[PDB]
Amino acid sequence: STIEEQAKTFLDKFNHEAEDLFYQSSLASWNYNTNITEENVQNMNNAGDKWSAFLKEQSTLAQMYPLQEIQNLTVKLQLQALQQNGSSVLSEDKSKRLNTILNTMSTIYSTGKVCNPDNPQECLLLEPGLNEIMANSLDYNERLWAWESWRSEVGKQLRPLYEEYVVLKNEMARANHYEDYGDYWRGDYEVNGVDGYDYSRGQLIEDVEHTFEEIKPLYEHLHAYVRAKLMNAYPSYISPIGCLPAHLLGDMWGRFWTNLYSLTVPFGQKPNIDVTDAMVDQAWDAQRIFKEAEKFFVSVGLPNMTQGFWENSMLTDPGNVQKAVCHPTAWDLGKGDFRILMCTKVTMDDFLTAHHEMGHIQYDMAYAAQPFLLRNGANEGFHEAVGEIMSLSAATPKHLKSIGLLSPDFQEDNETEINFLLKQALTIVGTLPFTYMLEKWRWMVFKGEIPKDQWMKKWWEMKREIVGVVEPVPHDETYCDPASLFHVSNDYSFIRYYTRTLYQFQFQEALCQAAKHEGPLHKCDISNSTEAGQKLFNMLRLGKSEPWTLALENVVGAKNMNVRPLLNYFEPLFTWLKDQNKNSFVGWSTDWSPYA
Amino acid sequence: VTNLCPFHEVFNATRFASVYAWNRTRISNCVADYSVLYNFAPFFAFKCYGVSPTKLNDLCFTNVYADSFVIKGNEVSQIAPGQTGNIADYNYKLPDDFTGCVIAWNSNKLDSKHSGNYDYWYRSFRKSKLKPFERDISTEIYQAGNKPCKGKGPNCYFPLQSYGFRPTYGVGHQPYRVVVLSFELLHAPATVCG
Ligand SMILES: *[C@@H]1O[C@H](CO)[C@@H](O[C@@H]2O[C@H](CO)[C@@H](O[C@@H]3O[C@H](CO[C@H]4O[C@H](CO)[C@@H](O)[C@H](O)[C@@H]4O)[C@@H](O)[C@H](O[C@H]4O[C@H](CO)[C@@H](O)[C@H](O)[C@@H]4O)[C@@H]3O)[C@H](O)[C@H]2NC(C)=O)[C@H](O)[C@H]1NC(C)=O
Ligand SMILES: *[C@@H]1O[C@H](CO)[C@@H](O[C@@H]2O[C@H](CO)[C@@H](O[C@@H]3O[C@H](CO)[C@@H](O)[C@H](O)[C@@H]3O)[C@H](O)[C@H]2NC(C)=O)[C@H](O)[C@H]1NC(C)=O
Ligand SMILES: *[C@@H]1O[C@H](CO)[C@@H](O[C@@H]2O[C@H](CO)[C@@H](O)[C@H](O)[C@H]2NC(C)=O)[C@H](O)[C@H]1NC(C)=O
Ligand SMILES: *[C@@H]1O[C@H](CO)[C@@H](O[C@@H]2O[C@H](CO)[C@@H](O)[C@H](O)[C@H]2NC(C)=O)[C@H](O)[C@H]1NC(C)=O
Numbered sequence: 085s086t087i088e089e090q091a092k093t094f095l096d097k098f099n100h101e102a103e104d105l106f107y108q109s110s111l112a113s114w115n116y117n118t119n120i121t122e123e124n125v126q127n128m129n130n131a132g133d134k135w136s137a138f139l140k141e142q143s144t145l146a147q148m149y150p151l152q153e154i155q156n157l158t159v160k161l162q163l164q165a166l167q168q169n170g171s172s173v174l175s176e177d178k179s180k181r182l183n184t185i186l187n188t189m190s191t192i193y194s195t196g197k198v199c200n201p202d203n204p205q206e207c208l209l210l211e212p213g214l215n216e217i218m219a220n221s222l223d224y225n226e227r228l229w230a231w232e233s234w235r236s237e238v239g240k241q242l243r244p245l246y247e248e249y250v251v252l253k254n255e256m257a258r259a260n261h262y263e264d265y266g267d268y269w270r271g272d273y274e275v276n277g278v279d280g281y282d283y284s285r286g287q288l289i290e291d292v293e294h295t296f297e298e299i300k301p302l303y304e305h306l307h308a309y310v311r312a313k314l315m316n317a318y319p320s321y322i323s324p325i326g327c328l329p330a331h332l333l334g335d336m337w338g339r340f341w342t343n344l345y346s347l348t349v350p351f352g353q354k355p356n357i358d359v360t361d362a363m364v365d366q367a368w369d370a371q372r373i374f375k376e377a378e379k380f381f382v383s384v385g386l387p388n389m390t391q392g393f394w395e396n397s398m399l400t401d402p403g404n405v406q407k408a409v410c411h412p413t414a415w416d417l418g419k420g421d422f423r424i425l426m427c428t429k430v431t432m433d434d435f436l437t438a439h440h441e442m443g444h445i446q447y448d449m450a451y452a453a454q455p456f457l458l459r460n461g462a463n464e465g466f467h468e469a470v471g472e473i474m475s476l477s478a479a480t481p482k483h484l485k486s487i488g489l490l491s492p493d494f495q496e497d498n499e500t501e502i503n504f505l506l507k508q509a510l511t512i513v514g515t516l517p518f519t520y521m522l523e524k525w526r527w528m529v530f531k532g533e534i535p536k537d538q539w540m541k542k543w544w545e546m547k548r549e550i551v552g553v554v555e556p557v558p559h560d561e562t563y564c565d566p567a568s569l570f571h572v573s574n575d576y577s578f579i580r581y582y583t584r585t586l587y588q589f590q591f592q593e594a595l596c597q598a599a600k601h602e603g604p605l606h607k608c609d610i611s612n613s614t615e616a617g618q619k620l621f622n623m624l625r626l627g628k629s630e631p632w633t634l635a636l637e638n639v640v641g642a643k644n645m646n647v648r649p650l651l652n653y654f655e656p657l658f659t660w661l662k663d664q665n666k667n668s669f670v671g672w673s674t675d676w677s678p679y680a
Numbered sequence: 681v682t683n684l685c686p687f688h689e690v691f692n693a694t695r696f697a698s699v700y701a702w703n704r705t706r707i708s709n710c711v712a713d714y715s716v717l718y719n720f721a722p723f724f725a726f727k728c729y730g731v732s733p734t735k736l737n738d739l740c741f742t743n744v745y746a747d748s749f750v751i752k753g754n755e756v757s758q759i760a761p762g763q764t765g766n767i768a769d770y771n772y773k774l775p776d777d778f779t780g781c782v783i784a785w786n787s788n789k790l791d792s793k794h795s796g797n798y799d800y801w802y803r804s805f806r807k808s809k810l811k812p813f814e815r816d817i818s819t820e821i822y823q824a825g826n827k828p829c830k831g832k833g834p835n836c837y838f839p840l841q842s843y844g845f846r847p848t849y850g851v852g853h854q855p856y857r858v859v860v861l862s863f864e865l866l867h868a869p870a871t872v873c874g
């Protein structure tokens with residue numbers, strides 16, 4: 085007979101109704117994504133509207149308990165989540181206008197296509213075309229034309245939409261009794277009302293700044309080496325002491341450097357590593373692929389799947405009659421069920437993605453005995469990182485030798501190890517600085533320090549200042565360069581990638597230390613060790629109850645992030661690049677421009 | 681001699697009753713039945729904490745009690761001597777020193793509907809704890825606030841929810857089958873033997 089008891093009973097009813105409706109929505113989404121029919125989209129919309137209306141109803145009901153006299157710290161978390169999700173705040177007309185703008189931006193930009201110049205016969209979409217354009221095709225003029233087509237005429241007539249959207253979202257953030265929308269994003273990382281491992285919104289910026297300051301020299305040396313290697317390919321557009329152009333990073337959107345692996349790797353005489361040819365000769369199919377992937381998690385001690393997921397969770401493409409857009413994702417069906425959707429082809433990358441999805445589903449099954457608004461990761465990046473680590477620690481040559489596909493005649497050469505480390509470090513070090521730059525600019529714009537007529541100018545200025553990559557052709561303020569990103573168009577949170585990349589090396593270092601492996605960090609395996617599995621299981625079943633600081637300290641003996649495990653991982657390539665660095669240039673200047 | 685009495689209607693009885701009001705069945709004064717107890721319907725559990733049933737037919741007890749219902753497939757551990765949590769302490773309480781056999785087995789194929797089995801209610805809000813071997817059929821709107829009921833709303837809730845079932849569910853949350861065996865005795869013959 086108390087306010088907390090009343091709140092607990094309310095949560096008891098919530099943790100049944102929400103379960104039912106979320107299961108409905110998950111079934112509808114799974115059926116739509118495995119089977120594309122108009123009536124399937126109809127029931128999708130019906131389920132979405134039902135879920136939105138239900139959340140609105142309970143957010144309206146939440147006024148019974150004032151959010152000031154609750155002490156259990158779990159009911160408080162549940163009620164705060166209820167107040168955060170499902171509460172309509174702004175006026176109906178303003179909300180409708182904002183939602184209309186959001187709907188009219190992303191879908192139209194996705195469906196936008198550019199035709200063959202002076203030839204309307206061919207009009208390639210986003211999925212084909214540019215993927216091969218930013219590939220082995222070395223036509224500088226064609227790549228520049230594609231970049232101009234994908235940037236100029238869309239940023240023009242997309243700029244006003246985002247210019248109104250930022251103001252509308254600032255109005256929404258102010259209406260939600262909050263500070264700037266940057267504060268609203270940082271809110272997810274903020275947890276308070278606890279002793280010892282307390283956090284807030286005024287520490288993440290400083291942590292990011294410190295990590296970037298610590299990591300700068302490694303990226304400096306790596307991109308200097310990349311520029312030195314690339315000088316030979318196109319010695320007509322890059323100054324020796326200038327800046328790199330935008331459209332020669334191997335991808336129009338950047339964010340990844342895996343494409344440039346081809347004409348950058350040293351010691352091409354040493355063969356690479358791949359088992360694709362041997363797989364078909366040994367008669368490997370999708371079922372055996374998934375069984376082999378699951379065998380590792382079985383051996384480490386974690387529970388394996390049941391007569392559910394295996395019978396369900398279609399893994400083979402059923403031709404074109406039941407064609408479906410298949411991006412491998414882990415499905416949380418709900419009410420004691422888990423599924424995986426993925427088109428399967430016999431390739432190393434597909435095997436790696438299968439490992440990633442298996443880790444995702446294993447984690448999601450690991451945490452299940454919690455209320456509805458508690459089943460998630462402590463931070464946004466944990467959910468992806470806990471699978472990224474498992475995917476990473478399976479392509480090691482020791483793991484391949486344990487598997488047995490690789491012939492023993494393969495030689496453990498230091499050159500081969502250097503090449504593998506370079507291949508990994510390309511993507512790993514490329515993904516960080518651009519992400520930090522984009523986040524810094526988006527936070528600066530949302531807070532407010534520059535006007536719209538200087539927005540793009542300041543964009544390009546700080547892009548050259550930090551990233552060191554200059555646009556090949558100067559851009560006016562009518563365009564919107566950041567708007568090209570899909571996640572920018574969908575205004576999804578972007579710091580997740582940086583956080584997970586920072587956390588994964590902490591996890592790997594701690595787990596390898598637990599396994600007590602001797603040698604270089606990359607040659608570390610957990611095939612037979614069980615203490616690492618127990619240490620990870622100590623956290624995988626927690627949920628959102630314990631804060632991220634407490635969980636991370638309990639796992640790795642550290643209350644926050646630190647780049648030192650990453651530096652230790654990259655020490656060998658760091659030494660090799662330091663040895664190679666004898667006829668290169670240190671640092672870069674923004675004085676040079678591609679347009680003279 | 682030349683006669684006996686089976687449990688033919690204990691199973692194969694089609695319609696069951698929810699845990700809302702667990703029904704009670706009883707037999708007496710005729711030959712018992714234990715030979716065909718475990719020759720079909722592979723049981724998920726067979727824990728007989730009262731007396732080992734290997735020689736159950738050797739001894740007898742008058743007026744045995746037989747019960748059956750469908751609740752879940754994972755919370756079977758709730759039905760045990762001295763354990764609480766939703767069902768165990770609010771719908772069907774178990775005596776502390778009771779002696780009997782608890783049998784639970786899975787019949788997901790039979791008792792699931794592909795369009796949604798939404799016709800098996802259960803209670804999770806009762807005023808107080810329950811006494812050993814106590815049932816109830818009461819239907820009153822639950823209240824936990826200063827104001828009276830006068831309908832539903834803030835701090836006004838229905839005392840009943842539903843067991844929505846879907847065949848695509850995983851193991852553990854599917855509707856299993858639960859049967860409970862019990863017996864008593866006073867000055868009388870034991871009335872059920874073999
Ligand atoms: C409170 O409210 C907030 C927002 O209102 C909720 O946050 C949302 O949470 C969901 C999931 O919990 C987020 O969904 C995620 O979307 C990502 C974006 O992917 C896009 O691109 C793919 C194609 O690659 C599309 O298929 C997809 O539809 C998106 O358009 C996904 O990448 C995420 O998937 C990740 O996890 C799966 C496994 O689950 C992995 O296999 C994937 O590889 C990937 O790592 C995910 O689906 C959603 O974006 C969030 N909203 C926002 C605005 O960010 C909270 O969940 C809610 N609180 C609750 C419900 O308690
Ligand atoms: C804050 O609220 C939480 C949520 O209820 C409280 O946790 C609860 O603590 C009790 C006390 O142990 C738990 O009861 C026990 O449950 C187990 C079954 O899990 C049962 O076998 C035991 O006999 C006992 O009844 C209860 O389960 C637990 N609830 C949850 C959701 O974990 C917590 O105590 C509260 N803290 C304060 C300071 O109010
Ligand atoms: C994909 O979806 C379509 C329609 O959304 C399904 O087609 C229906 O299937 C049911 C199943 O018996 C039939 O009763 C309907 O008559 C079908 N309608 C049409 C228009 O074909 C189809 O079965 C789904 N695919 C799979 C593999 O189940
Ligand atoms: C972990 O244990 C498994 C089996 O317990 C090891 O798998 C064996 O690996 C050797 C490698 O030479 C093979 O010859 C065996 O055939 C494998 N076992 C089976 C049953 O096929 C695995 O190698 C161990 N992990 C590590 C890192 O050594």
Ligand SMILES: *[C@@H]1O[C@H](CO)[C@@H](O)[C@H](O)[C@H]1NC(C)=O
Pocket residue numbers: 382386387388389
């Ligand atoms: C893993 O799968 C095997 C089947 O080969 C099963 O016997 C075992 O019980 C599973 N692991 C767990 C923890 O249930």
Ligand SMILES: *[C@@H]1O[C@H](CO)[C@@H](O)[C@H](O)[C@H]1NC(C)=O
Pocket residue numbers: 691692
């Ligand atoms: C009921 O008994 C008949 C034979 O009398 C048998 O064929 C059937 O399978 C039984 N049903 C169940 C649910 O055991």
